[PDB]
Amino acid sequence: GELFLVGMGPGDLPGLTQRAREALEGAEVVIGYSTYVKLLEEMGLLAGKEVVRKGMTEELDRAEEALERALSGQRVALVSGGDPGIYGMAAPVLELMEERGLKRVDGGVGLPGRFAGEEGEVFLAVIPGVTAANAVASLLGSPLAHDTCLISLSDLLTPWPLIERRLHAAGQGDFVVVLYNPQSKRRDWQLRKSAEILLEYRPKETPAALVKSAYRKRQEVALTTLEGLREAEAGMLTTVVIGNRQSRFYEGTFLTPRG
Amino acid sequence: GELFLVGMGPGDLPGLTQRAREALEGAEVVIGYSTYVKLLEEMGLLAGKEVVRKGMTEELDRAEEALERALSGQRVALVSGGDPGIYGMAAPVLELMEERGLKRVDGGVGLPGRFAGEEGEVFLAVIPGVTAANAVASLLGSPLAHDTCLISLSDLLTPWPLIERRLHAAGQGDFVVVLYNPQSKRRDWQLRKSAEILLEYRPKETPAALVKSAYRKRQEVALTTLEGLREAEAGMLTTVVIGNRQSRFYEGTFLTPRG
């Protein structure tokens, strides 16, 4: 069967690539987390297709569901917000295929590729999409105009000590920092802690920003400073951007110099 | 006037977002480096528009050209490969506007935004696109599935010592690394040096890859190891990806684990 991991971009119809539109068009079954599936449903892109979102809350369940359906011979589209390879479905799917002992049967390298196992075969492809970092940057100015680090604050499946390590490294290397999954329930202090770590490498007045629901309804852009981040509140659909030692604000824009 | 910095994505027609297509459609004048402009011309997207590519070799010239035209009241589309905010035109344009003393006249934050000065006004917007990192990752597997660092090896306008610093930090933090502008003429040793720096933090057998002209003609995917990178040759349209201490190869795919 076919299994296409389709990156949706930030969330609006214009945000998808034609390649993503085409992948959805050819899919017989579309799988993804409720919120994303509904966005596509509202766009009117899932008419006449089997839509699967019930019981798709868990990352692993979505991957297993999509893989078993593809192995059975269905043309599946597993949707991800932004890009599937950035804290998305690409990794869970490959890890599951590896676990199931699927082997490449076309002699190729990378993807797309055809794989097969005792339980069938699957043509796997990843359709890229605009990731949150680039999407929120377009709503800020040129914050990522220089070397950037992408870090997820989702301690889920990743030790906080390591995240601290990633933050110190990003801090000492003077990288612009983009925080994915900035705030949680279990640990409502991670954002503040992240800011304090970075504060040891760059000024309090270092430009920072919290962009919520980029390109979606209730989109919100909030400019602040690294120091201000210590008391900031972030949602589940928020991406935080922290400038480097050269970043500065220019007439409302977050400007990170090219040189 | 209008000035839209349009991200083209990797280079093929399906790679553009509908938002990018729409920005080009509404533009009266399209500006960009020869190679990118021609790609769009081949796609048949510039019919009936004033196309500017002669004398557009320099980054600064393209920005100045686009800005002066917009200030004069033209609807301009300044095109960039991938995303305009990743080693693109977003920074040069903002820096030029700042230099010219343009001030925001709509009370907004971030972008899009309207700016004006002694020489006129301009409505500035950045249309995001799939950046090379995400585009080549889709052709590899799930290499960027965890925290990633984007570094440009273009010593142009950026001291090599700093790049070394960025590399050591990325190395010590165990970040997956994506190298933009990997090889030059003046310094045909930067790639090898970069590999040697990272070799002090992760194994020789650490997965690595060189992806050339992703989604374009003569696209090429080459899998190798960090050690192998010391003797690798990269082109101007090549992006290099180096896995972290957990990355591994799986049946032809570059797999960086999610946890």
Ligand SMILES: Nc1ncnc2c1ncn2[C@@H]1O[C@H](CSCC[C@H](N)C(=O)O)[C@@H](O)[C@H]1O
């Ligand atoms: N529209 C949007 N606006 C702001 N941040 C967003 C966003 N969509 C996704 N994110 C960010 O991404 C996190 C989910 S992690 C999955 C990310 C996705 N594969 C991508 O490429 O963007 C969120 O917690 C948030 O930090």
Ligand SMILES: Nc1ncnc2c1ncn2[C@@H]1O[C@H](CSCC[C@H](N)C(=O)O)[C@@H](O)[C@H]1O
């Ligand atoms: N189609 C493609 N395949 C591989 N690398 C590419 C590419 N297009 C751009 N790049 C990478 O980007 C570098 C130019 S720097 C400009 C990058 C662009 N704004 C973006 O978002 O991708 C190249 O030297 C190369 O490393």
